[PDB]
Design a protein around this nucleic acid. Structure first.
Length: 903
DNA sequence: CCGGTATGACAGCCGCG
DNA sequence: GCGGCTGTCATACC
């Protein structure tokens, strides 16, 4: 076991480092680290240090870190480059850990915790911490225990002690249904007053100081609340004790709407799971509360309870504590499934960064490049300031709004990283420029060949073809490492496949499993010894083969995340290797790539189908094209297929045997045209879409850019048993659309694509007939409540006040003076309903808090004055009219066809 | 340094016998 | 009394 770091920090002239030593003990170092930086020298000086341009550099070794930083300032003032790693934590990490870091998670203290604060005032602001903390649950990964700190006496009540016996019983029995997996792991400790609880929490914290601190919302609530509460009661000194190094910083995050405060605790890595989830789940969610996320991932959700949470400790303290325990457990259950902390650990040690820096593609890439360049004796350039300048981005084709019967899609693989490698784009790789013609001209191969000597992008940039680029090289590494780890993973699974055959009939022997590497396939010497081994040993071989498979995935998805990060970093002015010209070279090349192939696919299909000038490519967005396949079917006739699977087979074969070769030679022409270093434009078939054979369905339609629906039978080789709707952009995918309406519109779209017009019309009619019988919650729109006060003038709407905001103000006037009525809060989500004119309320609409029923003190009148006609038109009929117009279908039996013209 | 390329709901304005 | 704008806001996705 070789030693690894936990946290690193710079305080004045010292690095403070937490680490696990070569014996496995957690330890702390103070090091007066001596940094090196670099300046340019004359050719006469014999150094081994060269910058990325091959210019000689001299190494300046500093007495301390403040001198290095002051030297940087003096170089800026003189106007000469100061080269080298200016974040001395990274340099320190690279010097102390100059090898492939292998870590052991079991020795890393990972804490997740959750706080409860009874507040009759509303949401208790963490910057004020006005109210007692009346519960803390704190899970420690090393102990494997939940530590529960419970306040028995507060201004808001004196309560009984929580019962673990009651907590384990069923909900039918008065129990809390706390799972038996964690019941034997709760360490319960009650307290007579807040001061005792808080001081015991602090001492506990010093004995078990988190390396990684997590939990749902910990960074914007729990941490700032605990810190400020302790601060207000005991003083700043006592609050600083939450940092291993007694150093804290009050950071004010100034988001482009308001401002909030987070507290930096020096010597701890905070990885808020809500940010970890938003960063690595890659699934857009209507809500990011723990409830919605828990039920999505675990199909269980957060614990239920009666009445407002501000009254739960008074009325049912038993529930209150258990609810706090389950909350922490939900976060752990999610992490058991998604494993985002491991992910963070793996990448942090890979790049050799502070773990919390995994949230920064810039820091990560900076460190990866810095490190490999260090080991070649190369010197990184000074980070330079650049003005934020918008540049061309992705090409999106304007589609003709229509129905499309048969559609086949194709994707460029890793487009932008591929373009970097193909063209050899890198700061030190710029060779010159050429007179640029219109993009159109390069797309049609009419413009003159830019260069015979250099590799080119159509923004006018030229790059050396000999030199290996710093950025292209570093990204190629990551590519290779991914294939490598995926090569171990498939072998680790296929090695377990042979093991499962031996699971049928083994024979007992007192021995341990033989020495094998599951990263590579078994030899015939090992294969003969498979059946001979014991039943105990074969279950351990299956254990370790699967353990090898888990090591592969984490490695290969991390590398995937880097690949998809690089462009982002390269487009950022704060990135060391950023160059505006290079950025636009990437996107512009991408724009040409997609349209040149759209040309090639159209030309190939026209010739093969006999026709001329017809548009086969109906749509294209960034890296993907969508191809109309109607003519390819009509060439064979649709009456010649036996079932749906037949024509799906036909199109599948046709793409692979006819179209993909046409594409490959199409891009090779483009590579030769731009004189690029290597050909890396590869395209995979994704989707085959169309209507069921012998049905009246239309298969698919586009209404605009990024707004379409397809009936998909196959996605990249995998054939679906039942057809799957792919819907992008449409109201069905919007969280603001009422629940019943999202359902009704999806069925409308299903009927259009699979069943046809008559089906749609029968449904629409019926839904209209039955609309008034649906629940008022299921037919209400949802919105976010931003800037309430801005449009609020004495309890009434002001200039430019949005519709939902108006609704909120109608509600507030209706509940004015009623404290027990649910309050509408800034930032939160609201239900919105239109109201009939003449209503006793103020306005044309009302809005109440989402996820809840309206107060009974207003419910009857809301239900009475609800404007069904307006609600149906606004949320259902109008968006449907959009779909049907584009698909050229009627949703109502007799609609005039002169409605479709601009008279 | 933990947002491009998009569409749609809606407010409010402008010409218009 | 309503298209034809512009502007604010809301929510999608790679």
């Amino acid at each position: 076991m070789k030693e690894f770091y936990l946290t690193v920090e710079q305080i004045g002239d010292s690095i403070f480092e937490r680490y696990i030593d070569s014996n496995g003990r957690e330890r702390t170092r103070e090091v007066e680290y001596k940094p090196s930086l670099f300046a340019h020298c004359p050719e006469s000086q014999a150094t081994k240090y060269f910058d990325i341009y091959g210019k000689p550099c001299t190494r300046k070794l500093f007495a301390n870190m403040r001198d290095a930083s002051q030297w940087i300032k003096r170089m800026e003032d003189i106007g000469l480059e100061a080269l080298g790693m200016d974040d001395f934590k990274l340099a320190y990490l690279s010097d102390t850990y100059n090898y492939e870091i292998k870590y052991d998670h079991t020795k890393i203290r990972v804490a997740n915790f959750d706080i409860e604060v009874t507040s009759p005032d509303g949401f208790p602001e963490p910057s004020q911490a006005k109210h007692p903390i009346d519960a803390i649950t704190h899970y420690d990964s090393i102990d494997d225990r939940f530590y529960v700190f419970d306040l028995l006496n507060s201004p808001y009540g004196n309560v009984e002690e929580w019962s673990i016996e009651i907590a384990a019983k069923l909900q039918e029995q008065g129990g809390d249904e706390v799972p038996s997996e964690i019941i034997d792991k709760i360490i319960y400790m009650p307290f007579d007053n807040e001061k005792e609880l808080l001081m015991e929490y602090l001492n506990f914290w010093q004995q078990k100081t988190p390396v990684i601190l997590t939990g749902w919302n910990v960074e914007s609530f729990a941490i700032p609340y605990v810190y400020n509460r302790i601060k207000n009661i005991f003083g700043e000194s006592t609050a600083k004790r939450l940092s291993p190094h007694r150093k804290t910083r009050v950071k004010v995050i100034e988001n482009m709407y308001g401002s909030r405060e987070i507290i930096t605790l020096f010597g701890i890595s905070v990885l808020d799971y809500i940010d970890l989830y938003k960063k690595f789940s890659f699934t857009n969610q209507p809500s990011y509360s723990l409830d919605y996320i828990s039920e999505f991932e675990l199909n269980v959700g957060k614990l239920k309870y009666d009445g407002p949470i501000s009254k739960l400790r008074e009325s049912n303290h038993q529930r209150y504590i258990s609810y706090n325990i389950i909350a922490v457990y939900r976060v752990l259950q999610i992490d058991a499934k998604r494993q985002f902390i491991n992910l963070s650990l793996d990448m942090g040690y890979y790049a050799k960064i502070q773990i919390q820096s995994v949230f920064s593609p810039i820091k990560t890439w900076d460190a990866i490049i810095f490190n490999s360049l260090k080991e070649q004796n190369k010197v990184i350039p000074q980070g330079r300031s650049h003005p934020v300048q918008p540049y061309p981005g992705a090409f999106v084709k304007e589609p003709i709004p229509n129905r499309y019967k048969y559609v086949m899609s194709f994707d460029l693989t890793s487009l932008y990283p591929s373009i970097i490698r193909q063209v050899n784009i890198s700061p030190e790789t710029i060779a010159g420029t050429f007179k640029v013609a219109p993009l159109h001209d390069y797309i049609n191969a009419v413009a003159e060949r830019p260069s015979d000597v250099y590799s080119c992008s159509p923004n006018g940039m030229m790059y050396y073809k000999d030199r290996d680029g710093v950025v292209p090289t570093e990204i190629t590494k990551v590519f290779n490492q991914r294939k490598e780890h995926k090569g171990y993973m498939l072998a680790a699974q296929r090695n377990g496949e042979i093991i499962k055959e031996a699971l049928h009939n083994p024979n007992l022997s007192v021995d341990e499993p033989l020495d094998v590497d599951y990263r590579f396939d078994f030899s015939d010497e090992i294969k003969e010894k498979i059946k001979k081994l014991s039943a105990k040993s074969l279950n351990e071989m299956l254990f370790r083969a699967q353990r090898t498979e888990v090591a592969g995935m984490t490695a290969q998805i991390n590398r995937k995340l880097l690949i998809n990060s690089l462009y982002g970093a390269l487009g950022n002015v704060w990135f060391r290797y950023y160059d505006l010209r290079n950025a636009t070279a990437i996107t512009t090349f991408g724009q040409m790539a997609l349209q040149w192939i759209e040309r090639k696919v159209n030309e190939y299909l026209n010739e093969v189908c006999g026709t001329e000038g017809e548009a086969f490519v109906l749509y294209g967005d960034t890296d993907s094209i969508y191809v109309s396949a109607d003519k390819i079917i009509d060439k064979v006739g649709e009456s010649k297929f036996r079932d749906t699977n037949h024509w799906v087979d036909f199109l599948d074969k046709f793409a692979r045997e006819r179209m993909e070769p046409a594409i490959d030679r199409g891009f090779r022409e483009m590579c030769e045209y731009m004189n690029n270093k290597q050909h890396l434009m590869f395209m995979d078939r994704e989707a085959i879409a169309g209507p069921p054979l012998g049905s009246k369905g239309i298969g698919g339609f586009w209404t605009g850019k990024k707004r379409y629906a397809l009936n998909v039978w196959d996605m990249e080789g995998t054939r679906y048993a039942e057809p799957k709707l792919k819907i992008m952009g449409l109201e069905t995918q919007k969280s603001s659309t009422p629940k019943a309406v999202q359902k009704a519109l999806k069925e409308c779209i299903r009927r259009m694509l699979q069943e046809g017009e008559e089906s749609l019309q029968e449904y629409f009619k019926e839904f209209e007939k039955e609309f008034r019988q649906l629940n008022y919650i299921s037919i209400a729109s949802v919105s976010s409540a931003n800037n309430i006060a801005k449009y609020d003038v004495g309890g009434f709407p002001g200039p430019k006040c949005p519709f939902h905001i108006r609704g909120i103000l109608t509600y507030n006037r209706a509940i004015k003076g009623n404290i027990d009525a649910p309050q509408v809060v800034e930032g939160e989500k609201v239900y919105v309903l239109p109201l009939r004119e003449g209503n006793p309320f103020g306005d044309k609409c009302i809005a109440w808090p989402s996820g809840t029923e309206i107060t009974d003190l207003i419910k009857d009148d809301v239900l009475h004055w609800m404007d069904y006609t307006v609600l149906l038109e606004k949320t259902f009929i109008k968006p449907l009219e959009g779909f049907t117009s584009a698909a050229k279908l009627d949703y109502e039996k007799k609609a005039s066809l002169f409605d479709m013209f601009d008279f």
